[PDB]
Design a protein around this ligand. Structure first.
Ligand SMILES: [Mg+2]
Ligand SMILES: [Mg+2]
Ligand SMILES: [Mg+2]
Ligand SMILES: [Mg+2]
Ligand SMILES: [Mg+2]
Ligand SMILES: [Mg+2]
Ligand SMILES: [Mg+2]
Ligand SMILES: [Mg+2]
Ligand SMILES: [Mg+2]
Ligand SMILES: [Mg+2]
Ligand SMILES: [Mg+2]
Ligand SMILES: [Mg+2]
Ligand SMILES: [Mg+2]
Ligand SMILES: [Mg+2]
Ligand SMILES: [Mg+2]
Ligand SMILES: [Mg+2]
Ligand SMILES: [Mg+2]
Ligand SMILES: [Mg+2]
Ligand SMILES: [Mg+2]
Ligand SMILES: [Mg+2]
Ligand SMILES: [Mg+2]
Ligand SMILES: [Mg+2]
Ligand SMILES: [Mg+2]
Ligand SMILES: [Mg+2]
Ligand SMILES: [Mg+2]
Ligand SMILES: [Mg+2]
Ligand SMILES: [Mg+2]
Ligand SMILES: [Mg+2]
Ligand SMILES: [Mg+2]
Ligand SMILES: [Mg+2]
Ligand SMILES: [Mg+2]
Ligand SMILES: [Mg+2]
Ligand SMILES: [Mg+2]
Ligand SMILES: [Mg+2]
Ligand SMILES: [Mg+2]
Ligand SMILES: [Mg+2]
Ligand SMILES: [Mg+2]
Ligand SMILES: [Mg+2]
Ligand SMILES: [Mg+2]
Ligand SMILES: [Mg+2]
Ligand SMILES: [Mg+2]
Ligand SMILES: [Mg+2]
Ligand SMILES: [Mg+2]
Ligand SMILES: [Mg+2]
Ligand SMILES: [Mg+2]
Ligand SMILES: [Mg+2]
Ligand SMILES: [Mg+2]
Ligand SMILES: [Mg+2]
Ligand SMILES: [Mg+2]
Ligand SMILES: [Mg+2]
Ligand SMILES: [Mg+2]
Ligand SMILES: [Mg+2]
Ligand SMILES: [Mg+2]
Ligand SMILES: [Mg+2]
Ligand SMILES: [Mg+2]
Ligand SMILES: [Mg+2]
Ligand SMILES: [Mg+2]
Ligand SMILES: [Mg+2]
Ligand SMILES: [Mg+2]
Ligand SMILES: [Mg+2]
Ligand SMILES: [Mg+2]
Ligand SMILES: [Mg+2]
Ligand SMILES: [Mg+2]
Ligand SMILES: [Mg+2]
Ligand SMILES: [Mg+2]
Ligand SMILES: [Mg+2]
Ligand SMILES: [Mg+2]
Ligand SMILES: [Mg+2]
Ligand SMILES: [Mg+2]
Ligand SMILES: [Mg+2]
Ligand SMILES: [Mg+2]
Ligand SMILES: [Mg+2]
Ligand SMILES: [Mg+2]
Ligand SMILES: [Mg+2]
Ligand SMILES: [Mg+2]
Ligand SMILES: [Mg+2]
Length: 244
RNA sequence: GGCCCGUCUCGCCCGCCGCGCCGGGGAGGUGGAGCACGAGCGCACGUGUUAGGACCCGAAAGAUGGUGAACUAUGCCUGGGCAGGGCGAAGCCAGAGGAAACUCUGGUGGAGGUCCGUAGCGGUCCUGACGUGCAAAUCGGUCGUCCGACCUGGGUAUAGGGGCGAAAGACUAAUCGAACCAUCUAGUAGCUGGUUCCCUCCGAAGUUUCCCUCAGGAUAGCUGGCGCUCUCGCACACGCAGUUUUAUCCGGUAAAGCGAAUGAUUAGAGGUCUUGGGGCCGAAACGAUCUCAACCUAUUCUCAAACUUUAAAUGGGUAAGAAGCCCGGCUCGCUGGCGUGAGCCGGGCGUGGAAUGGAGUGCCUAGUGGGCCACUUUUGGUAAGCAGAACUGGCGCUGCGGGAUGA
RNA sequence: UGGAGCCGCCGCAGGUGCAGAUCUUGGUGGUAGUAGCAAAUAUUCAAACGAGAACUUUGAAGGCCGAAGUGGAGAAGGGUUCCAUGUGAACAGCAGUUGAACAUGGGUCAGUCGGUCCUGAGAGAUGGGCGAGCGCCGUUCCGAAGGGACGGGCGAUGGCCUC
RNA sequence: AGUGCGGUAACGCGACCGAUCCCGGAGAAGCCGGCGGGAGCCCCGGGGAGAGUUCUCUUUUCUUUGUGAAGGGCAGGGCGCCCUGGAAUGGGUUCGCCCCGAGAGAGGGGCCCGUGCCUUGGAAAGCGUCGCGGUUCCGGCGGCGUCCGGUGAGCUCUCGCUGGCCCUUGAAAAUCCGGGGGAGAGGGUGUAAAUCUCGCGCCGGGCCGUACCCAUAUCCGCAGCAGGUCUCCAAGGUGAACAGCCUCUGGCAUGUUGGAACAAUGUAGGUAAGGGAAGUCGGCAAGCCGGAUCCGUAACUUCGGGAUAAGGAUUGGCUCUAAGG
RNA sequence: AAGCAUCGCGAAGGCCCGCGGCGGGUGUUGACGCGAUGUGAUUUCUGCCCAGUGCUCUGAAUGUCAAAGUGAAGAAAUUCAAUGAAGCGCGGGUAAACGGCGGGAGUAACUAUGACUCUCUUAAGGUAGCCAAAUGCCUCGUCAUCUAAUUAGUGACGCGCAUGAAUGGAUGAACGAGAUUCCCACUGUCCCUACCUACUAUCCAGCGAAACCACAGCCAAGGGAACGGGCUUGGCGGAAUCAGCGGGGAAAGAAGACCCUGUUGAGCUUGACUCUAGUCUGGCACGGUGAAGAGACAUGUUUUUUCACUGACCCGGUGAGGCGG
RNA sequence: GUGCCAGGUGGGGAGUUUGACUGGGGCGGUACACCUGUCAAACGGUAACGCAGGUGUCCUAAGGCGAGCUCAGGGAGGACAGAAACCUCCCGUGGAGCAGAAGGGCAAAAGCUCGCUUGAUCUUGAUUUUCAGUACGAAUACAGACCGUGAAAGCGGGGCCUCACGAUCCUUCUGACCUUUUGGGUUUUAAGCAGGAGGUGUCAGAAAAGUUACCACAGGGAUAACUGGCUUGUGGCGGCCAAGCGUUCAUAGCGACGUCGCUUUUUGAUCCUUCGAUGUCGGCUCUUCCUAUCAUUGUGAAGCAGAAUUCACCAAGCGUUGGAUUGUUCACCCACUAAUAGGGAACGUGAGCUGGGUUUAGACCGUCGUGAGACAGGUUAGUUUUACCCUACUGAUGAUGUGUUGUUGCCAUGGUAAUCCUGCUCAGUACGAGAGGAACCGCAGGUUCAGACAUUUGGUGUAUGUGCUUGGCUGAGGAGCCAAUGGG
């Protein structure tokens, strides 16, 4: 048969991301002497909307402590961050909203977001539109910390890394329905070509493993194993349960 | 008969540089493509069987390497475009009714994947026109939509078992259930079509057996050619038959029979064989009357491809002599009271019933392996110009006279 | 008729005889002077040129496209098709004195109009990696990736070595 | 002493030192609605020049009736620009909004666009008329005019203000400019260093394409093919309309031919007494209604609609009245 | 398509591309995200079943279990025995996974049926709803109604060959170039046809092909290879043509597509036969250093469990900008 | 994590297969390897998806000897005991049994019961059976040994005879003081020779699941779906006899139990033509033909009194309707009518029409299948090509002879055409108990058809004849024009 969709998505070139009008990479400020020992101050110039993202970004300008130059950064502004606000960053930073500081120095129970997974990767976790990670417990020896991710998972992350304080601005975005194929088209047009999703039962049996037959039925069990090959692994990928 | 090699059986004898798990020999079975005082080699010609393009033309295919996103499918970048009207969302103003609570009314306002509708986009219906057209998909009326999932130019990206698809296996340059170009490739085909001068002579088969065999091959059969071995209407013939006769056997078919067996089956008559049921005279009785289920005795009617005592006609084998008789004698390890039986020698006797034939034998070897019809017999079927058999003859392969025409 | 080679016999050899193959090439008939030259209302009179006028030209009349045009200019594409003169052999499915046909010529002038410059979607080199290999992957990734300039110091020629 | 001066200020004047460095802006931003300013075109009342009718009328019908880029001045828009002053009895104000003690009305100013008018260009040229020079060749010669105004939700273009929508936020770089600093330079009392050049003066700007068609005949469809192909401009009338119809500017000969008759069957339009779908698989085709104004509008419903539901009346011309600046 | 509901994934990850690599898309991404599904707005509801096929969880409590390694015999090739990973078996979960939802017996004061109870193959046996449906062979089921007449339409009944609950059931406003039935007006659809117009067709001036063609062409019967233009017997036949016409030429158009055969293919599916990419697991090498601990042989050898270090190797950031005492 | 092995998963992907016979193919069966009786026509041989059947086993004895008896059944008897329990006598040609299906064969056996046994052992050939005179399987006499049994003759190397079974290659076991193991010697191992086994049931022997309506190719009328051809079981129709129905009375009208025929208007049966194509159903239109006559004309018979209605003859001349439903062929219903008879012409008729439902490709539902998919199950939307050729026909010029022309005509031949009904009088009469209820000739007219014609009426209408008007244009009036014929 043909190569199925999803299997065709790996090559790209029609399925790549629409990264034309996006305003850059939303990354934390990298670690240095000021991040490690003290704190350096920056100003929030403006807040911008990034295409394909439900969260607004914030242009934050710092002064470079080694060369005379105003360094700008792309943070994700917490809900409540206004322009003209002094965002501090480092180890000695005070605990308030929009003030990135390490998890080993913050008290536990702190609602944080834009969390680093490994120390130094400029912010990876819990930073979509309204999500937040919580700090459960610390550990003085070996510098480890327990962090609850917004999926309910509970992860051992080292205490050396940092996160901005608060929730991601733009919460409640999924509470409103789309109401239109047009609004869903405009939503995914800024992201990537993935929205018109033909069900594989309605397809011919040569471009999908569920197509064919005089009636639109699946025919085989839709729950497939993890050890399934490419072009076959279609349906419910290694389902533990499947019902309501 | 004899000999060589392999294998099997029964037994003994001979020789040594090394006396042995040595080597050789006898007789009798049996297998070999052997010997038995050679016949091959080399070249050329004809035919047949093959491998090769293989008599010629022909596929649906498969693989390898490249070319296309000028059409179309989708994503991105940059530009362009979309009259005039209808309904009147939020917000806002004013008035009226009442107590706030509030409720109506008149405006303003211009939202909608809203409505009519132009340009644009597309193509429902007339299944209209045309249908060797204007056109390898157009035209007219009627149409759907026309501010958002809209239309469109240029640039660009995705390339063939790949792409792309609001998903029709649709599109991918008039080519898509796997594009196009070139090569392997003159791919293969038990399958269709065709196969080129004359005359003479001979001349078929659709059948046996086997094959994943049923449109085909192989093998026998039918056929042609090349020959050989012999005989002679030159005073002087051994053998052979789709033939008959003379003797000798075989049958179990037609017919006939079942007063004979097996199976079916009709009706009277005479006998308590022997019980029993509906029964009638009787408490009952083989005491009188008959009945049928199975009883007997002689009779009587109709049968049988898978019954038969009998039993034809047509048929099938044999013998009609010299390869036959009559004698005398050797051999035997078979059998053996002497004897048998078989094999070798030597000698003596020729028209072996009718008519007709000149016979025997060895190589190659094409085509065929779809048949059909008719007298008689016969299976299945209501029957068939139906299907399937037996002998024989025809058509096929064959004209000619007749049946008006015509296998 | 033709104008330059050819045949009989003995032998050898072959790309050696056509009526077919929806055979291959070329040519020609019936059909047949037939189908047809019928989508978007329409032409008419007089004169000039000529051998020749329904189609050329001029004048007049009547019409059509009706400013989302049958108008005036560009892009892609075509490449001389643009213009003048002459011809009417072939083409303009009738004709033509006409044409985008033929034959001679001629015509496109830029600091300001565009390309040229930049970058977008993207393409594509060096390093690096992969691959038997033509090469392929990738555009910051396993890079010593700058060839520039101010102020000062040394040295040197050129121009009236002062500058 | 002297790298300028003026204003309360927004800022202005013809220049008005300045580096490596840093910061910022322009480049550089969606779609739609509404309003306002300006232009081009259209309309009306006239005045001039030339053409048409004038069998009757018509101070009449048609054409024309202007000024480039580049500087200066002034109208006209916009201001989220500044000063005085502090407002409820709330005010100003738009089509709608909206604004105001974080400073509204009322005064006084300032900046930007000024494509509009005048002005240099510039009336010499262009146009419309009348009359001539020259046999011809001849880019001519002269007499006049190119004027005064107003309206409009008019069509198109441009600029500005404001609002709506987005689970859409609507591009980069080349290049140019401004600011913060003060490394550094200047001459020492008539000169200089400087002039992100204030005015003038001098030289140069190389290479490539430039014609025509652009579409019922110059392109692609085998062709002068009823097909396909991206755009700019858009007159008058009727009319809601850039719908349809007629006309002006411009264009053409009816689309690979004409003549004579009007047979059948065709193709495309129509019309039919009486019946109204009885025809046919099937109201297929055809036919009825249709614009606007005034009434009126059911069931159901997601309370938005249905809905132009269904169903009635009117529509011409002429002469007036009243209202709308 | 929005709405609804699932599944996987916390980055040495999920899905996927790639001959290849510290390769690449999602990713300028981070559970309100990405990838794979089913159903298809609103309301309401989504019953029972894990026996089967799938998917998934742990388990030295373990049947099967390859290679490498361990021990025993021999002169060795070789053989034997124990150990024996993942996966299959065993045990839970899972139906908005694929799917399935039948029979038998007893039982109610008329009969009938079964509210109730037990069992089967195999796990429950069709729940709420709905229907002669687009779904019902019988069938044109039965009744009511629409008609003069209805195999059509609508409303009810359920005995439903063979309806049924996200393989979604039911209802439902608006919408539909979707499919059916009736009614009002309307009309040549028809009774039943008629006439007019334009372009053709007709003739003419000029120009002018193409399909097709064994020979060509009047019929009745007979026979034939079983429907003759030709043969036989009859009927008979007479030059050259024009406009129509559709009866014939089993007219043309294309080596029937239907059905069959071929030891001919191709697209697809899987519980067909062989394989294979990917993926999971085990062994050897890259692969080092220390700590305690358990087991086996035996009076040093092997299987090893976890932790600690970086020095190989991997990941992240930077303009490798302050790392350890 | 990489490199290399090992194990699981694997239609994500690749290659390939999906037997044969067959009154077309699938389904159903094996007629695919064998055996008996018949077919089978008196040697043998002989076919069909001809008939009845049977087989892929079973037997340590059911094999091999020797001995003794007779079996099944019947009659007669005997306590329980009867029809069948056990004992005895007689008859008893096999009418029982021999493992099975059938046939043949058999009486001191080939059966039953005993006693002993393993000839059911090893090794060469020859022959028969299907046959090509090749195998395999089975069998037939023998030959050499070793044996069993019996007193011996002899019998026996499997089953009383006809079936009970299997190549190459590979593997396994057994046997020889067997050969080789490639320089020589030993040993393990391996290869050889022969015999047996592990099996090819499609049985002379590939290793093998489906679907295609998205399909393709080479062919076939060797082979179907249509029509045509033979037959007529079936469908329809007509006779022969005559027990009865009919108040008596077989035959006015019918007619059982039986039997003889016609038709291709129905379905069957066959495969003879066509698969280098003969357009596959209905309906619309239109023409001709048959009679097996519904009505009309002329008649005969009735259980014909009249009316009405049945049977039968000559007879196809003229008629056989409008609709609701269904695609319908059929069917049923409403109404009219004299009557609403049955059929054929390639199941008349697609270069005549339509495309309604079969019968492409898109879809939805139900059943089946894991699936792709299938369903004379239901629904929906689905391009209907060409005549200008020859003939036939409809019309039109014409043509040959009459010396040429014109007028007037005749005529062979060919076509043919009229049909049916209502009202009045007869007549409320004939007839009849009554109810009811005719017929002939006349009179007035209608239905269908045919041939004409436009006085009237209706339609058409571009005399573009004449008014009325919408928009635009010629300066206005007048006169007009365009708007594919502006409209009325
Ligand atoms: Mg589909
Ligand atoms: Mg698949
Ligand atoms: Mg199913
Ligand atoms: Mg060849
Ligand atoms: Mg050859
Ligand atoms: Mg070939
Ligand atoms: Mg292949
Ligand atoms: Mg269509
Ligand atoms: Mg059509
Ligand atoms: Mg035509
Ligand atoms: Mg399909
Ligand atoms: Mg001869
Ligand atoms: Mg064959
Ligand atoms: Mg016999
Ligand atoms: Mg007999
Ligand atoms: Mg043959
Ligand atoms: Mg036959
Ligand atoms: Mg030669
Ligand atoms: Mg020739
Ligand atoms: Mg003509
Ligand atoms: Mg034309
Ligand atoms: Mg032009
Ligand atoms: Mg020219
Ligand atoms: Mg010409
Ligand atoms: Mg103010
Ligand atoms: Mg130009
Ligand atoms: Mg133009
Ligand atoms: Mg017009
Ligand atoms: Mg015309
Ligand atoms: Mg003309
Ligand atoms: Mg033209
Ligand atoms: Mg009428
Ligand atoms: Mg009807
Ligand atoms: Mg209609
Ligand atoms: Mg309504
Ligand atoms: Mg689901
Ligand atoms: Mg459920
Ligand atoms: Mg389960
Ligand atoms: Mg229920
Ligand atoms: Mg109806
Ligand atoms: Mg109903
Ligand atoms: Mg169900
Ligand atoms: Mg269902
Ligand atoms: Mg013929
Ligand atoms: Mg015809
Ligand atoms: Mg064929
Ligand atoms: Mg074909
Ligand atoms: Mg075969
Ligand atoms: Mg092959
Ligand atoms: Mg293929
Ligand atoms: Mg398998
Ligand atoms: Mg496969
Ligand atoms: Mg294949
Ligand atoms: Mg077959
Ligand atoms: Mg015989
Ligand atoms: Mg005995
Ligand atoms: Mg012996
Ligand atoms: Mg015996
Ligand atoms: Mg299908
Ligand atoms: Mg089918
Ligand atoms: Mg045949
Ligand atoms: Mg037939
Ligand atoms: Mg009959
Ligand atoms: Mg009687
Ligand atoms: Mg044909
Ligand atoms: Mg035909
Ligand atoms: Mg008669
Ligand atoms: Mg009808
Ligand atoms: Mg027919
Ligand atoms: Mg026809
Ligand atoms: Mg047709
Ligand atoms: Mg149809
Ligand atoms: Mg279909
Ligand atoms: Mg003609
Ligand atoms: Mg006559
Ligand atoms: Mg007038």
């Amino acid at each position: 048969g043909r190569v199925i969709r999803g299997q065709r998505k790996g090559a790209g070139s029609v399925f790549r991301a629409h990264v034309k009008h996006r305003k850059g990479a939303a990354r934390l400020r990298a670690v240095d002497f000021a991040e490690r020992h003290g704190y350096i101050k920056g100003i929030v110039k403006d807040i911008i909307h990034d295409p394909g993202r439900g969260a607004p970004l914030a242009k934050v300008v710092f002064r470079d402590p080694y060369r005379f130059k105003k360094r700008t950064e792309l943070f994700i502004a917490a809900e409540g961050i206004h322009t003209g606000q002094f965002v501090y960053c480092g180890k000695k930073a005070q605990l308030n909203i929009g003030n990135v500081l390490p998890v080993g120095t913050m008290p536990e129970g702190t609602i944080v977001c834009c969390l680093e997974e490994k120390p130094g990767d400029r912010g990876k976790l819990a930073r979509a539109s309204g999500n937040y990670a919580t700090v459960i417990s610390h550990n003085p020896e070996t510098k480890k910390t327990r962090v609850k991710l917004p999926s309910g998972s509970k992860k051992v992350i080292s205490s050396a890394n940092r996160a901005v304080v608060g929730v991601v601005a733009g919460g409640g975005r999924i509470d409103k329905p789309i109401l239109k194929a047009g609004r869903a088209y405009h939503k995914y047009k800024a992201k990537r070509n993935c929205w018109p999703r033909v069900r594989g039962v309605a397809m011919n049996p040569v471009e999908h493993p569920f197509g064919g037959g005089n009636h639109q039925h699946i025919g085989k069990p839709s729950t497939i194993r993890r050890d399934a090959p490419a072009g076959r692994k279609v349906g419910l990928i290694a389902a533990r349960r499947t019902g309501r």
